[PDB]
């Protein structure tokens, strides 16, 4: 997960559209390239349902996901 946010763009105090990416460490770019070339073929069924993002996880108890057992 990138340290920054991923992905009404401004309803109440939203995130920026984009950030510079050519000014970051080349090692970080290499790592991002490696992880993306490993991940484009495999992301996970949860991500197919909904991806745990940097901001969505922070905002709410998304990974908590309160729910009862099978009816």
């Amino acid at each position: 997960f990138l340290p920054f946010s991923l992905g009404g763009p401004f309803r109440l105090g939203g995130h920026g559209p984009s950030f510079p990416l050519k000014g970051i460490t080349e090692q970080q770019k290499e790592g991002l390239e490696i992880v993306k070339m490993v991940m484009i073929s495999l992301e996970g069924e949860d991500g197919l349902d909904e991806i745990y993002s940097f901001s969505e996880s922070l905002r709410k108890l998304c990974v908590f996901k309160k729910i009862e057992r099978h009816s």
Binding site: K66, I67, E68, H70, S71
Partner: protein
């Protein structure tokens, strides 16, 4: 708004009320008693905020407050009771008629002005607010005024007096039902219900007052005074009343906290709320818990307008309610709200809002479907225009279902059951069913309150029939049933 409704029963008792009346069945007295008993039962099961009374004109042994002649009062204005039912049923049937003759007789002179006098006195007797007053009078006389015209004039004057006071009287054919042969004289200034009263439909309560006069705050500046009106409530039996076995005495229930450690008593202040999570015993305060339940002030903060497409049948919550403007502390709300309501054809886009019905409770987002003015040609406004209080379920309100998938079936079975369900058509009526449990409970109450031998088991429309729909559909239900290996084991 409270107020008691009154209905007074007047019946002839001189000579024509205990006769065959060109029939072979019982006298008019017997089923008149049956009808008033039925209305007693209906009122008891319907509402206890009403008073009823019984008076007989034509009297050999007078008993009334003013002590006139040929005026006898049996039961005054009062809430109906089981002892009233016993008193009434003591004079039912032929045995009741002869008991009445033994203790009351028959054959006196009617005095209509005196009847109006005593009924007005009875109305003056009650100290409660009279929301509505009504008089019913049933007799075999279409015009009992062959006597002196002075009595007729006095009766007309008294009728005018009570009409000015607000009293209304009812009379309808008993001797010759049908034909408009009744009220030869009473048709002047006085204006079949036998089956309706005898139907004694019960197990229906009545609304007394609305609730929750809240504010429609479209912003932080402007508000609209409205009142949320209920239209459906899940009825249930009245709560049981704890009683003493020996004396049938009400019990002063007294629940309290206690400690076996010292034998003393704990106040509601020093008893702290507690929770268990992980490796800690979380302790909380009652007032802290109440504040936790508190989110904001009650009100309707408008959130926007959402097109009437997001609402889905499979997305449903606690019942929706009705909203009507209520100009009591904010004026101009009614006119603006009405302007909004009439503009609904363009306003198919439903209003969006978050609802806080009362204080210190979390709000739920609720859409506002504009209700229409479904006026009827009979000048009946069913569901006047307003807004539906449809509750929007939260993300946690959905339980996950298995993802098993099924593909489209063959259309021939689809067509055969299409014909099946088309032939087996049921004309749905909204007011066509009653809860069997509640009505059965009412039957038990009305049964195990009198000296009734065995209870009546009212037949409900809820119970499915065994073959009536089968013959309404025919044998094609099995003839068309060509499914191979039915799942029956």
């Amino acid at each position: 708004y409270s107020g008691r409704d009154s209905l007074i029963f007047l019946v002839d008792a001189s000579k024509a009320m205990f006769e065959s009346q060109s029939e072979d069945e019982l006298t008019p007295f017997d089923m008149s008693i049956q009808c008033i008993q039925s209305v007693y039962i209906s009122k008891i099961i319907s509402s206890d905020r009403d008073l009823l009374a019984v008076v007989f004109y034509g009297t050999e042994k007078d008993k009334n407050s003013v002590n006139f002649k040929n005026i006898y009062v049996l039961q005054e204005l009062d809430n109906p009771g089981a002892k009233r039912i016993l008193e009434l049923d003591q004079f039912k049937g032929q045995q009741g008629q002869k008991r009445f003759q033994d203790m009351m007789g028959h054959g006196s002179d009617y005095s209509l002005s005196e009847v109006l006098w005593v009924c007005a006195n009875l109305f003056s007797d009650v100290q409660f607010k009279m929301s509505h007053k009504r008089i019913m009078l049933f007799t075999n006389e279409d015009n009992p005024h062959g006597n002196d015209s002075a009595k007729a004039s006095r009766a007309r004057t008294k009728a005018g007096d009570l009409r000015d006071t607000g009293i209304f009287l009812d009379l309808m054919h008993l001797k010759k039902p049908g034909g408009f042969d009744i009220s030869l004289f009473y048709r002047d200034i006085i204006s079949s219900k036998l089956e309706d009263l005898l139907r004694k439909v019960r197990a229906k309560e009545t609304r007394k007052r609305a609730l929750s006069r809240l504010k429609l705050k479209l912003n932080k500046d402007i508000v609209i005074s409205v009142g949320i009106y209920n239209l459906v409530q899940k009825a249930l039996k009245p709560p049981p009343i704890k009683l003493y076995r020996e004396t049938n005495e009400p019990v002063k229930t007294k629940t309290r906290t206690f400690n076996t450690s010292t034998g003393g008593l704990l106040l509601p202040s020093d008893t702290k709320r507690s929770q268990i999570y992980g490796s800690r015993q979380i302790i909380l305060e009652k007032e802290e818990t109440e504040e936790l339940k508190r989110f904001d002030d009650p009100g309707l903060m408008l959130m926007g307008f959402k097109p009437l497409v997001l609402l889905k049948k499979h997305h449903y919550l606690r019942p929706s309610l009705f909203v009507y403007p209520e100009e009591s502390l904010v004026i101009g709300s009614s006119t603006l709200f009405s302007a909004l309501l009439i503009k609904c054809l363009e306003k198919e886009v439903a209003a969006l809002c978050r609802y806080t019905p009362r204080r210190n409770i979390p709000p739920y987002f609720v859409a506002l479907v504009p209700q229409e003015e479904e006026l009827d040609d009979q000048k009946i406004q069913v569901t006047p225009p307003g807004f539906q209080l449809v509750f929007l379920p939260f993300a946690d309100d959905k339980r996950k279902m298995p993802f098993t998938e099924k593909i489209m079936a063959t259309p021939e079975q689809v067509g055969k059951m299409k014909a099946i369900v088309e032939k087996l058509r049921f004309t749905y009526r909204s007011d066509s069913f009653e809860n069997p449990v509640l009505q059965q409970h009412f039957r038990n109450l009305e049964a195990l309150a009198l000296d009734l031998m065995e209870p009546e088991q009212a037949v409900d429309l809820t119970l499915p029939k065994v073959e009536a729909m089968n013959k309404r559909l025919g044998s094609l239900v099995d003839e068309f049933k060509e499914l191979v290996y039915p799942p029956d084991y």
